[PDB]
Amino acid sequence: SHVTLPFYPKSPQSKDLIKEAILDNDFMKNLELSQIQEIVDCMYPVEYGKDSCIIKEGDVGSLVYVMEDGKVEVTKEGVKLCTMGPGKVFGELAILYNCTRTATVKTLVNVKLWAIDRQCFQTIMMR
Amino acid sequence: SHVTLPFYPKSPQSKDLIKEAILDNDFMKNLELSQIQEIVDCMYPVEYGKDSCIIKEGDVGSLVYVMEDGKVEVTKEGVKLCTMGPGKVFGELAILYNCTRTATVKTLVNVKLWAIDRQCFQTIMMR
Ligand SMILES: Nc1nc2c(ncn2[C@@H]2O[C@@H]3COP(=O)(O)O[C@H]3[C@H]2O)c(=O)[nH]1
Ligand SMILES: Nc1nc2c(ncn2[C@@H]2O[C@@H]3COP(=O)(O)O[C@H]3[C@H]2O)c(=O)[nH]1
Numbered sequence: 636s637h638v639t640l641p642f643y644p645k646s647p648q649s650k651d652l653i654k655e656a657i658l659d660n661d662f663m664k665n666l667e668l669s670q671i672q673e674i675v676d677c678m679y680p681v682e683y684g685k686d687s688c689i690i691k692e693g694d695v696g697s698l699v700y701v702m703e704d705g706k707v708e709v710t711k712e713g714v715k716l717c718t719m720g721p722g723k724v725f726g727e728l729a730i731l732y733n734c735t736r737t738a739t740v741k742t743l744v745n746v747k748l749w750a751i752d753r754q755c756f757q758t759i760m761m762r
Numbered sequence: 763s764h765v766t767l768p769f770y771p772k773s774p775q776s777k778d779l780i781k782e783a784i785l786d787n788d789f790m791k792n793l794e795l796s797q798i799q800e801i802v803d804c805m806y807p808v809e810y811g812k813d814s815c816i817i818k819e820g821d822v823g824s825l826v827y828v829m830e831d832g833k834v835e836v837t838k839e840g841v842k843l844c845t846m847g848p849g850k851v852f853g854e855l856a857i858l859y860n861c862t863r864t865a866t867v868k869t870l871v872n873v874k875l876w877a878i879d880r881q882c883f884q885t886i887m888m889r
Contacts, residue, residue, distance in 0.1 A: 665860040731855075733843040733866050753788075760858045761792040761887070 643679045649703065650675050653749060656701040660693055660724040662731070667749025673759045678749035679726060683742050690740040696699065696729035697753035711738040767882050770806045776830065777802055779849060780876055783828040789858060793887075800886045804877035810869050816853075818869040823856025823875045832873025838865045845870065854877040857883065 645653075653675045657663050666674075678701065683689055690696065692711060702721050707714040709725070716738060716762045718727060730753070772780075780802045785789045790798075793863055805828065808847060810816055816827070819838060828851050836843045836852075846852060855864045 662859065662861065662864075667860075732838060756787050756791060760789055 638758070639698055640673070640677050641679075641703045642676050644669065645678075646677070647759055649705045649749075652703060653678060653694075653701050656722050656724045659722065660727060662727050663724065670762065672761055673762065674751060674756070677755045677759070678751045679729050681750050683746050683748070685742050685744045687742040687746075688739065689742060689746075690726060690736050690738070692736050692739040695737040697734070698750050699724065699726040699729075699756065701749045703749060705748075706743045707740050707746060709738050709740055722735060765885070767800065767804055767849065767885060768806075769803050770804070772805075776876070779830055780805060780828050782828070783849045783851050786849060789854060790851060796813055797886050797889065801883065804878045804882040804886070805877075807874065809872065809874050812869055812871050814869045814873075816867065816875075817863050817865070817868065819863050819866040821863045823853060823861075823863050824880050826853045826857055826880075826883055828876045830874045830876060831838050832875075833870045834864050835870050837866050837868070858887060 642709050654671055657666065657671055657674070680703075681700075683705075689700070689707065701724050702719060704721060706718055707725075708718045725740060726736075729735060734753075779841060784793065784801065790858065793801075816834065817823075829846060829848050830881050831848055834846050852867065853863070856862060878883075
């Protein structure tokens with residue numbers, strides 16, 4: 636009669652970081668505040684070690700990430716585009732380019748992230 | 763005193779094409795049926811010729827479309843992402859993400875579409 640989204644409990648400071656990361660993101664700054672709240676409770680945590688490759692350009696890609704701790708470097712076709720520290724969203728562009736990753740993301744140090752899948756996202760967007 | 767949504771009369775064949783098109787859409791799959799029916803009745807027909815530009819990335823989005831006949835070609839910042847045939851919904855991103863058109867959409871052949879405007883569309887998602 637309607638499918639249940641999963642809830643992942645977080646520290647207040649974490650929920651704040653996420654909200655701010657979305658509001659700082661060009662594609663998503665305008666979402667409902669009620670929608671953002673829901674996204675925050677759905678994001679689950681994932682950790683990567685340094686010289687780990689999170690996203691490979693060209694790949695198919697659902698997941699969207701917010702960085703909590705650490706630092707990554709974004710490269711396309713060989714070129715550094717930038718680095719990203721906590722408070723930044725990445726992985727959003729896949730959907731806008733036909734679910735294909737548009738750049739590769741490598742970890743420069745250990746990182747702690749939050750993630751959310753295509754599917755959760757879509758249910759939310761219809762509320 | 764509540765607002766009256768418009769009604770555009772349609773061939774049962776067309777009412778089904780639309781319904782299917784909605785269910786095929788990642789986001790709209792999610793709607794209750796009562797609502798998918800309301801949306802079907804608020805769609806109005808529009809045609810474009812070969813080599814027409816329906817949607818321009820960056821512009822403001824007010825309508826959402828379903829294709830009935832024809833083939834259309836999606837592009838972003840100058841790169842063929844995909845093509846779309848009958849039965850497929852489009853122009854739903856800008857509305858849901860409350861952003862500016864995320865891709866350009868050009869016709870490859872003469873097309874016949876149905877359109878619902880932001881107004882009716884949102885009004886419907888609220889019951
Ligand atoms: N393509 C691109 N991606 C970037 C840039 N800066 C940060 N990113 C992030 O890198 C991500 C790579 O995967 P996505 O395309 O899913 O989403 C992309 C963005 O979130 C940039 O300058 N170009
Ligand atoms: N940005 C983008 N839009 C697409 C793609 N494939 C289909 N579309 C549709 O094209 C529409 C362009 O305008 P919208 O951003 O409103 O909504 C978009 C989607 O419905 C794609 O790969 N990228």
